[PDB]
Amino acid sequence: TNVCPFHKVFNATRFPSVYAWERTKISDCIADYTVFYNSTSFSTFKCYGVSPSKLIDLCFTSVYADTFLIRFSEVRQVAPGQTGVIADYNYKLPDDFTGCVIAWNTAKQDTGHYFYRSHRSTKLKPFERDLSSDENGVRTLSTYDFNPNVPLEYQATRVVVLSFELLNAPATVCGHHHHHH
Numbered sequence: 665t666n667v668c669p670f671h672k673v674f675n676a677t678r679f680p681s682v683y684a685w686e687r688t689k690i691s692d693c694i695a696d697y698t699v700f701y702n703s704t705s706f707s708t709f710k711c712y713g714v715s716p717s718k719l720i721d722l723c724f725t726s727v728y729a730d731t732f733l734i735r736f737s738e739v740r741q742v743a744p745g746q747t748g749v750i751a752d753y754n755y756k757l758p759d760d761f762t763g764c765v766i767a768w769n770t771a772k773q774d775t776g777h778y779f780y781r782s783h784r785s786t787k788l789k790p791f792e793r794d795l796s797s798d799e800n801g802v803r804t805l806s807t808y809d810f811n812p813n814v815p816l817e818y819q820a821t822r823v824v825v826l827s828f829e830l831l832n833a834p835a836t837v838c839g840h841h842h843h844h845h
């Protein structure tokens with residue numbers, strides 16, 4: 665298997681709006697997570713259920729990459745069992761979450777009008793997506809203008825959620841060293 669398509673996911677011209685986040689299936693690859701933790705580009709790299717350090721030793725049966733665009737202020741909501749407009753009405757990470765979250769501040773590039781759900785009748789189920797714009801005829805989706813000139817807690821920020829499972833089925837996405845190194 666050839667190397668894992670991270671640059672094609674990460675350095676794409678556009679990231680989705682967060683209410684319409686997008687999944688990607690990754691398999692048959694040899695993953696190189698080295699790019700992340702650049703400390704001058706990746707401002708947040710935090711794993712749940714495994715050690716970011718232990719990613720280099722592990723093989724995964726299925727890896728999905730959920731992607732979207734929010735503000736710096738709201739990055740902290742992408743965590744198991746957190747509360748917020750994002751976690752309650754946009755993108756929900758399970759309580760039993762296994763995976764990583766990577767986030768970096770693309771403010772000078774991902775500029776424009778992006779959207780987010782502010783209100784919903786019920787909160788969200790884990791990993792559920794709601795692409796509806798109305799409830800009773802009112803727009804249920806409020807707007808972000810991302811600009812270079814807004815303060816940091818308010819700036820554009822791209823997020824990726826690598827969600828994997830270590831159960832049965834052929835082991836398909838293997839770190840550079842799943843041969844006991």
Ligand SMILES: *[C@@H]1O[C@H](CO)[C@@H](O)[C@H](O)[C@H]1NC(C)=O
Pocket residue numbers: 702704705
């Ligand atoms: C880390 O980020 C900087 C940002 O300018 C980039 O130049 C560099 O190539 C990245 N990583 C490496 C492998 O040096």
